[PDB]
Amino acid sequence: RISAINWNKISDDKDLEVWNRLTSNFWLPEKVPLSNDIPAWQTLTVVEQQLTMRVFTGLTLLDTLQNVIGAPSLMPDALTPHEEAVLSNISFMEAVHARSYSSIFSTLCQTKDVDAAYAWSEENAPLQRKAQIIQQHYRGDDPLKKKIASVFLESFLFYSGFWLPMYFSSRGKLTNTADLIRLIIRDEAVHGYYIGYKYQKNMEKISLGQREELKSFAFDLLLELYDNELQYTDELYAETPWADDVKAFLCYNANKALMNLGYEPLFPAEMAEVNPAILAALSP
Amino acid sequence: RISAINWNKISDDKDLEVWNRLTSNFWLPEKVPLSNDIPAWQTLTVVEQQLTMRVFTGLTLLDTLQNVIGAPSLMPDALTPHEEAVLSNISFMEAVHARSYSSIFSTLCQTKDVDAAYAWSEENAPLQRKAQIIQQHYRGDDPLKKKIASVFLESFLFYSGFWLPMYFSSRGKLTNTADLIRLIIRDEAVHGYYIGYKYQKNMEKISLGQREELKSFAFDLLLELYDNELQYTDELYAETPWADDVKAFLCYNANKALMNLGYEPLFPAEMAEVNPAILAALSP
């Protein structure tokens, strides 16, 4: 029996707070003057241009997965009708994120190179492995594992890719593209926070034993994704000097993903130390 | 095997056209200065105020249904990945529509009266009947009937309710609320058009016999919804002089719903003649 939603009877204030944050943060890639990055794009080497297109196709895959499978898989497990509505917004904004990479490709890149990057992503084992792992949990019957997987997608699995536009930005290149990516991050960080909040809400109702099983599962999953991401990073950044920097940014974000789920960080400061210029590019 | 969406390889230009129309038309109820309708609200009679709250709770139910069940039920039947993305936007904007009625209630109405209207909608047989009929098709296994039902929801079933704010607007009352409703209509008319377009695309592939069965089904369904809507209208508008005007507006919109599916109108001009002031309020 479907009932008319009532936003003046909020059972969890967080639902309204996040509804408002996400909807007031609405944007489209057309609002970013991407074409002003053409000059900076021309100063990149062929290897750097290839890297960027490969990175971006990978991010597109993850946003597409989150739009088509991820956010919708969370809907049946919502605690409130307002959460269900927030999830529809999350799903829609994931399609906006995905669409934005095509906006970048269209402005900056040659079609032959973009198509090569799409094909490379179809064949890349580490990329397909992380897509597969997350998808498996979204298709499963355990609602708490779906939320863990979602938080790891939103707060960890994009960041090997987000590093690169932030790096270019710190060097005064592709600054409009970086503005777009910062809009994506602004969404993803709220998504990871909210879904992690809901994970913790749902955990309030389950047994002490299952809580212990899930913490242990969360740590194991993150370690496995982390290992696979190191491999993905090596294959992306091989012909650059940046792999170590990317890896430190992975550890930094891995700790945030854990904190969104309510867990202590796994990665020590010496592994998660990000160049101040990268941090400055994130929050300019 | 999920693949990264590519918006520079559009297989149907309509998908991009509608993506752009709907996303560029993004709005939120907070952008409408609803509180400026408080004075006009105070000039309405108790009977007129009750009518309005009842009308609006009914519309909220239908938007909630379309967000939670309707638009998502169409996703598995999409012809293209871009259509899937447009459907996520449609679903999200239906939640925005639903949320907007709570914005109106919060600004203008007393909570005790709003709650009475919600309860009245739970008990109203004609309202629950149209929700049930549409929901049955959304839960079925016939993708073409889902689209027919959706077009009738978007291009017909809201209009007994949309009449009232358009009427008030023609009389210089609740003009900000009417602006909000016009934003809702702007979305619904595009939704009905696009889903009707897709119905016709999908029909290109089916047998002559099934096409005949579906036309006959569409006419029967619309006649049945029409009869039920006359009853809903009688129960809403009983203590007003407006029932006949509302009914003519129903016939007018019924013909548009049919045209969105590619069919000829059923209702003759003498049944579908809408007061020019109402038409003017729709397109001011």
From Swiss-Prot, chains A, B:
Catalytic machinery residues: Y101
Presence of the UniProt keyword Oxidoreductase in the record: yes
GO molecular function per UniProt: manganese ion binding; ribonucleoside-diphosphate reductase activity, thioredoxin disulfide as acceptor
EC class: oxidoreductase
Cofactor: Fe cation
Organism: Escherichia coli (strain K12)
Domain of life: Bacteria
Cofactor binding comment, as recorded: Binds 2 iron ions per subunit.
Name of this protein: Ribonucleoside-diphosphate reductase 2 subunit beta
